[PDB]
Amino acid sequence: VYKQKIKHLLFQNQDQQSELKKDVEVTLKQLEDQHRIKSRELKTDVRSLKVTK
Amino acid sequence: EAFIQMLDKNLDEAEDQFQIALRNHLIHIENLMQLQEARMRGLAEEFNRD
Amino acid sequence: EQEKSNLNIEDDGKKAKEKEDAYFEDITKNMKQLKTQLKSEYLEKEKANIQQ
Amino acid sequence: MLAKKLALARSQGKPDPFKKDEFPLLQHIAVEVVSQNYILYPDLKGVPENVRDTIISKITTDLDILTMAPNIDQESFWQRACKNRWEKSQKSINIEEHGRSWKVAYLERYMEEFLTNIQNADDPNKKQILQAELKAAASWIHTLNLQNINQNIDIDFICKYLPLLTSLTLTYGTKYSGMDYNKQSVGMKLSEAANLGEAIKNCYSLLSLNISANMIDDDLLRFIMAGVNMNISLIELNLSHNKIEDQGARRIAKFLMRNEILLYLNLGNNLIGYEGSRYLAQALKVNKNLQSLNLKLNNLGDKAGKKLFQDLMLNKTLLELDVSGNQFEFETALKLSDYVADSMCGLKVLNIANNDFNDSCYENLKTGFTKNYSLAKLDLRGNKFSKTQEEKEQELKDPFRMFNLSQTEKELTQIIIRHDLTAQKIQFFSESDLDKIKQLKELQGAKQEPEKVIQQDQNKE
Amino acid sequence: MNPSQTQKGKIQIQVSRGSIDLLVRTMYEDINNIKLKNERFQKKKRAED
Amino acid sequence: NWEYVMLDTLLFNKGNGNDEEGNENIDDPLNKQAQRDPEQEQLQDIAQLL
Amino acid sequence: EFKEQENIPRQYIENSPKEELVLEHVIQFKRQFQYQLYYEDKRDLFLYPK
């Protein structure tokens, strides 16, 4: 029973670990989205003002 | 010999725990590989769109 | 073991996010130099055209 | 409440503190009241939809499903509820995974919670609530994710009130396999498997079935297939993480030859052996709909794999083949190489790793793949191909470097790499090609170095 | 009229092709051999018992 | 007397274009590590020029 | 009649992302200017014509 609860309760450990990894992934994905949106607005600025140059 | 059957069948259950822990760990690895490949595809899409 | 794995995940994610922030800031500052090489140089080039 | 303040201000003879620009309207009061008591007007009849949306987006993020689903159409409220109930929950919410809508995501997540934690899932009151919820979200729930089914939940009854179900994934087991170690409490029992089969038979909108991790045996597979036979919408079947034997394989072959809609078949991690895969290939001989099949973790064997491939030569509809975990060897490599090299070999993605292919497998497989131009992705890592001492030292230095493909596996994969690149108009840049390009750039720099010095030496006179 | 000037795009498509080929192999050689070991040992113990 | 609607980058990005006379002493550079203004950097980032 | 044109250039049809960003920023600047000069006579600084 105790060995099982260890294998489980590794259920809890796994679940919290997966929570942390998925939170990390979402934070990184949204940070990348913000950075890439900034970069695309910037590349629009480039394509737009180099035309005047 | 029933006690030996115990070391056989109870150890069968213990090794079933072993193999199911390995099975679940393989599930963990295969799910982690999918998420890492999702990260890789995001980075590639970044590359290609740039 | 759970705390070790949790802190490993948290610190790996912090490393990942800091790496991505450095990525974004570096490329953004590179283009910012280039873009400063668009407007200011546009005015200086107009000056140069007039003088030429 | 402002009336009390007005009366107090006017009763003291002081200048009116109520400047006329500070009075909220009866519309304000009514909107706030309805926002705080949305259950009073779940449909918000008789009120402008501006007030309706203001109220629904001001609602708390923890409304009851029965009133939020059919009465709230606001994705803002639905996503806010999803987050607040699961924002810091161990399970994140991704918009991409629910048809790009948060309302259906919340509905299906709440259904998943209800079924997974349904204590005595056959309670009469719980059945009443379940029927109400199913009617509320029927046109709005299509798939469910239930994990470690701790009780015999009526799969058929659940399907009977969700007409738009398309994907079903059942994993019977102990969500809490802690203080109590029970083998029968984990995985679907006889009644659970029969109920799943009845649900499959009585459900017409389902397309994907994933009953893996249930330790599904031949009896469970047959019970499910009893109702599956009358179903006409299943396109994908997955039975991994189970114990389905060659009798289940024969039953699946019969279902396949009698059926013409299945496209994805996952039979991996099962006890399918030589004659089980022989039945699989016999069914495939006449089968013309199955597209992706996986038998990884099975025990087919070399002869089983070769019977499968010899029937596959005529079974030309195969596109994805994951034959890993069955420990193929030389003659299997010969036959798979012949099948792939066959100009009619329709397989596009092949996972033949986990096998026992050897150097003698090298020549046959390489020839077959070089003659084949259809395969797109392949899996051959971990094979016993002869590896150089360099690779041996790399693996020794990095235990994770045992994952590294041998050089021979490298060229074998790269052959299909050129195949795909030629097929889809892209140049193949080999290891030698890239090294030569780098060396050429370095030599170009070296040759350009002295020209600048020579030019600079001509301006000192 | 530089052909390189005209097909900078085709130069960079090849560059991206090389980078993608690098990444694919880099991840492939790291993906899966422990799964092979585990499946083969599962079959080993199946036969043993 | 007069105010400007828009926020531009020219005034703050033309400051470094003073490297014109450079033909002379290469004196020790590490002593030029003046503190970059965190307030100015944060203002630049937050008020990103329209 | 230019609007009646069957093939009017898109430049006369819609506001791009950056163009709408600048439009909103200038609108906010106008709002702030009116906020700070409630009393001064409103002078139509005709910045956004159709």
Q: Does D426 sit within 8 Å of E17, measured CB to CB?
A: yes
Q: Is residue A47 within 8 angstroms of chain C, CB to CB?
A: no
Q: How is residue C19 annotated by DSSP?
A: H
Q: In angstroms, what separates the C-alpha of D182 from chain A's closest C-alpha? A: 9
Q: In angstroms, what separates the C-alpha of A18 from chain B's closest C-alpha? A: 10
Handedness of CA D10, D12, D18, D19 (dihedral sign): positive
- The CA dihedral of D408, D413, D418, D419, to the nearest 10 degrees, is 130
State the Cα–Cα distance between residues C38 and C42, nearest whole angstrom: 6
Handedness of CA D81, D83, D89, D95 (dihedral sign): positive
Angle between helices D274-286 and D301-312 (to 10 degrees): 0
Nearest Cβ partner for D241 among B13, B16, B23: B23
Mutation for A interface: G11, G15, G18, G25, most A CBs within 10 A: G18
Count Cβ atoms below 10 Å from residue D208 Cβ, excluding itself.
18
Q: Does C35 sit within 8 Å of F10, measured CB to CB?
A: no
Assess contact for D135 and D161: CB atoms under 8 A: yes
Q: Is residue A33 within 8 angstroms of chain D, CB to CB?
A: no
Q: Is residue A19 within 8 angstroms of chain B, CB to CB?
A: no
Q: Beta strand D377-379 with D349-351: parallel, antiparallel or unpaired?
A: parallel
Residue D314 CA: distances (Å) to CA of D11, D282, D305, D307, D345: 98, 10, 15, 12, 9
**Resolution in angstrom units:** 3.6
Q: Which two tokens stand for residue D75?
A: 């994705």
State the Cα–Cα distance between residues D168 and D305, nearest whole angstrom: 30
Q: In angstroms, what separates the C-alpha of E35 from chain B's closest C-alpha? A: 7
3-state secondary structure of D379: strand
Could you tell me which of B36, B47, D96 has the C-alpha nearest to residue C12? B36
Residue B40 CA: distances (Å) to CA of B25, B36, B37, D120: 22, 6, 5, 44
Find, in chain D, the residue whose alpha carbon is nearest to that of B23: D241
State the Cα–Cα distance between residues A47 and D39, nearest whole angstrom: 53
Could you tell me which of D36, D93, D38, D113 has the C-alpha nearest to residue D69? D38
State the Cα–Cα distance between residues D308 and D285, nearest whole angstrom: 9
Angle between helices D330-341 and D301-312 (to 10 degrees): 10
Which residues make Cβ contacts (< 8 Å) with residue D42, sequence separation at least 6?
D67, D68, D70, D71, D72
Q: Does G21 sit within 8 Å of F6, measured CB to CB?
A: no
Assess contact for D346 and D317: CB atoms under 8 A: yes
3-state secondary structure of D170: strand
Q: Which amino acid is at A53?
A: K
D377 sits in which H/E element: strand D377-379
Could you tell me which of D211, D314, D240, C16 has the C-alpha nearest to residue B30? D240
Q: In angstroms, what separates the C-alpha of D83 from chain A's closest C-alpha? A: 13
Q: How is residue D98 annotated by DSSP?
A: G
Q: Which two tokens stand for residue D95?
A: 């918009």
Counting Cβ atoms within 10 Å, is residue F30 exposed (0-12), middle (13-18) or buried (19+)? exposed
Residue D192 CA: distances (Å) to CA of D153, D155, D173, D197: 7, 8, 11, 9
Q: Scan for tokens 């990184």, then name that residue.
A: A28
Q: Which amino acid is at C2?
A: Q
Assess contact for D92 and A22: CB atoms under 8 A: yes
State the Cα–Cα distance between residues C30 and C26, nearest whole angstrom: 6
Could you tell me which of D208, D65, D218 has the C-alpha nearest to residue D133? D65
Radius of gyration of chain G from its Cα atoms, rounded to whole angstroms? 15
Kindly report the backbone phi and psi dihedral angles of residue D379, in degrees, each rounded to the nearest multiple of 5, phi listed first: -130, 115
Q: What is the DSSP track for B1-32?
A: -HHHHHHHHHHHHHHHHHHHHHHHHHHHHHHH
Chain E CB contacts of D299 under 8 Å are 43, 46
3-state secondary structure of D209: strand
Mutation for G interface: A40, A44, A46, most G CBs within 10 A: A44
Mutation for C interface: A15, A31, A45, A51, most C CBs within 10 A: A31
State the Cα–Cα distance between residues C41 and C34, nearest whole angstrom: 10
Q: Is residue A23 within 8 angstroms of chain B, CB to CB?
A: no
Counting Cβ atoms within 10 Å, is residue D373 exposed (0-12), middle (13-18) or buried (19+)? middle
Assess contact for D148 and D164: CB atoms under 8 A: no
Handedness of CA D65, D67, D72, D76 (dihedral sign): negative
Q: Which long-range contacts (CB under 8 A, 24 or more apart) does D75-80 make?
A: D75/D101, D75/D102, D75/D103, D78/D102, D78/D103, D78/D105, D78/D106, D79/D106
Q: Does A12 sit within 8 Å of C2, measured CB to CB?
A: yes
Q: Which two tokens stand for residue C5?
A: 């794995």
Count of residues in chain D: 461
State the Cα–Cα distance between residues G50 and F27, nearest whole angstrom: 59
Q: Is residue A29 within 8 angstroms of chain B, CB to CB?
A: yes
Q: Which two tokens stand for residue B22?
A: 């390995």
State the Cα–Cα distance between residues F18 and D71, nearest whole angstrom: 66
Chain C CB contacts of F8 under 8 Å are 39
Chain D CB contacts of B19 under 8 Å are none
Counting Cβ atoms within 10 Å, is residue D175 exposed (0-12), middle (13-18) or buried (19+)? middle
Which residues make Cβ contacts (< 8 Å) with residue D296, sequence separation at least 6?
D268, D269, D322, D323, D324, D325, D326, D351, D354, E39
Strand ranges across the sheet with D292-294: D143-149, D167-172, D208-210, D236-238, D264-266, D292-294, D320-322, D349-351, D377-379
State the Cα–Cα distance between residues D312 and D305, nearest whole angstrom: 10
Q: In angstroms, what separates the C-alpha of C13 from chain A's closest C-alpha? A: 5
Q: Scan for tokens 């994908």, then name that residue.
A: D236
A42 sits in which H/E element: helix A10-52
Could you tell me which of D251, D274, D275 has the C-alpha nearest to residue D265? D251
D236 sits in which H/E element: strand D236-238
Q: In angstroms, what separates the C-alpha of D273 from chain E's closest C-alpha? A: 11
3-state secondary structure of D373: coil
C-alpha angle D225/D230/D235, rounded to 5°? 75
Q: Is residue D177 within 8 angstroms of chain A, CB to CB?
A: yes
Q: Chains with 3 or more CB pairs closer than 8 angstroms to D?
A: A, B, E
Could you tell me which of D163, D157, D68, D69 has the C-alpha nearest to residue D115? D157
Could you tell me which of D216, D224, D266, D268 has the C-alpha nearest to residue D243? D216
Assess contact for D380 and D405: CB atoms under 8 A: yes
Could you tell me which of C26, A11, F17 has the C-alpha nearest to residue D174? A11
Q: Does E23 sit within 8 Å of B40, measured CB to CB?
A: yes
Count Cβ atoms below 10 Å from residue D122 Cβ, excluding itself.
12
Assess contact for D428 and D418: CB atoms under 8 A: yes
Which residues make Cβ contacts (< 8 Å) with residue C26, sequence separation at least 6?
none
Which residues make Cβ contacts (< 8 Å) with residue D369, sequence separation at least 6?
D337, D340, D341, D375, D378, D412, D415, D416, D419
Q: Chains with 3 or more CB pairs closer than 8 angstroms to A?
A: B, C, D, G
Could you tell me which of D170, D180, D166, D172 has the C-alpha nearest to residue D138? D166
Count Cβ atoms below 10 Å from residue C30 Cβ, excluding itself.
10
Q: Does A13 sit within 8 Å of C5, measured CB to CB?
A: yes
Assess contact for D174 and D150: CB atoms under 8 A: yes
Counting Cβ atoms within 10 Å, is residue D436 exposed (0-12), middle (13-18) or buried (19+)? exposed
Could you tell me which of D211, D206, D169 has the C-alpha nearest to residue D187? D211
Residue D432 β-bridge partners: none
Find, in chain A, the residue whose alpha carbon is nearest to that of C40: A53
Nearest Cβ partner for A21 among C9, C31, C35: C9
Nearest Cβ partner for A4 among B17, B39, B50: B17
State the Cα–Cα distance between residues D379 and D328, nearest whole angstrom: 13
Q: In angstroms, what separates the C-alpha of B28 from chain A's closest C-alpha? A: 9
Chain A CB contacts of B11 under 8 Å are none
State the Cα–Cα distance between residues A50 and C42, nearest whole angstrom: 9
Q: Which two tokens stand for residue D183?
A: 């083998």
State the Cα–Cα distance between residues C15 and D333, nearest whole angstrom: 44
Counting Cβ atoms within 10 Å, is residue D393 exposed (0-12), middle (13-18) or buried (19+)? exposed
Residues 403-422 of D with CB under 8 A from E: 403-405, 410, 413, 417, 421
Cβ-based contacts under 8 A for chains C and F? 14
Which residues make Cβ contacts (< 8 Å) with residue E29, sequence separation at least 6?
D381, D401, D403, D404, D405
Kindly report the backbone phi and psi dihedral angles of residue D171, in degrees, each rounded to the nearest multiple of 5, phi listed first: -135, 90
State the Cα–Cα distance between residues D299 and D246, nearest whole angstrom: 10
Helices (H), D14-118: 26-36, 49-58, 65-71, 75-86, 102-116
Q: Does B44 sit within 8 Å of E20, measured CB to CB?
A: yes
Q: Which amino acid is at D6?
A: L
Q: Chains with 3 or more CB pairs closer than 8 angstroms to C?
A: A, F
3-state secondary structure of D431: helix
Angle between helices D407-423 and D359-371 (to 10 degrees): 10
Q: Scan for tokens 């899996």, then name that residue.
A: D379
State the Cα–Cα distance between residues D238 and D297, nearest whole angstrom: 14
Q: In angstroms, what separates the C-alpha of E41 from chain B's closest C-alpha? A: 9
Could you tell me which of D425, A45, D97, C19 has the C-alpha nearest to residue B43? C19
3-state secondary structure of A13: helix
Helices (H), G1-50: 17-36
Q: What is the DSSP track for F28-42?
A: -STT------HHHHH
Counting Cβ atoms within 10 Å, is residue F27 exposed (0-12), middle (13-18) or buried (19+)? exposed
Assess contact for D139 and D164: CB atoms under 8 A: yes
Chain G CB contacts of F50 under 8 Å are 21-22, 25-26
Mutation for B interface: A4, A7, A35, most B CBs within 10 A: A7
Report the Cα–Cα distance between both ends of chain B, in Å, rounded.
Answer: 71
Q: Does E34 sit within 8 Å of B47, measured CB to CB?
A: no
Count of residues in chain F: 50
Q: Which two tokens stand for residue C45?
A: 């080039």
Q: Chains with 3 or more CB pairs closer than 8 angstroms to F?
A: C, G
Residue D246 CA: distances (Å) to CA of C15, D280, F2: 49, 9, 88
State the Cα–Cα distance between residues B19 and B21, nearest whole angstrom: 5
Q: Which two tokens stand for residue D94?
A: 């991704």
Q: Is residue C43 within 8 angstroms of chain A, CB to CB?
A: no
Could you tell me which of A43, D86, C40 has the C-alpha nearest to residue F15? C40
Q: Chains with 3 or more CB pairs closer than 8 angstroms to B?
A: A, D, E
D208 sits in which H/E element: strand D208-210
Q: Does A1 sit within 8 Å of D90, measured CB to CB?
A: no
Radius of gyration of chain D from its Cα atoms, rounded to whole angstroms? 32
State the Cα–Cα distance between residues D421 and D443, nearest whole angstrom: 29
Could you tell me which of D213, D260, D273, D271 has the C-alpha nearest to residue D239? D213
Residue A36 CA: distances (Å) to CA of B12, B31, B46: 54, 27, 8
Residue A1 CA: distances (Å) to CA of B6, B13, F2: 16, 12, 82
State the Cα–Cα distance between residues D312 and D352, nearest whole angstrom: 15
Assess contact for D340 and D372: CB atoms under 8 A: yes
Radius of gyration of chain A from its Cα atoms, rounded to whole angstroms? 23
Nearest Cβ partner for A36 among B14, B17, B46: B46
State the Cα–Cα distance between residues D360 and B28, nearest whole angstrom: 35
State the Cα–Cα distance between residues F12 and F5, nearest whole angstrom: 17
Chain interruptions in chain B, by residue before each (C–N > 2.5 Å): none
A26 sits in which H/E element: helix A10-52
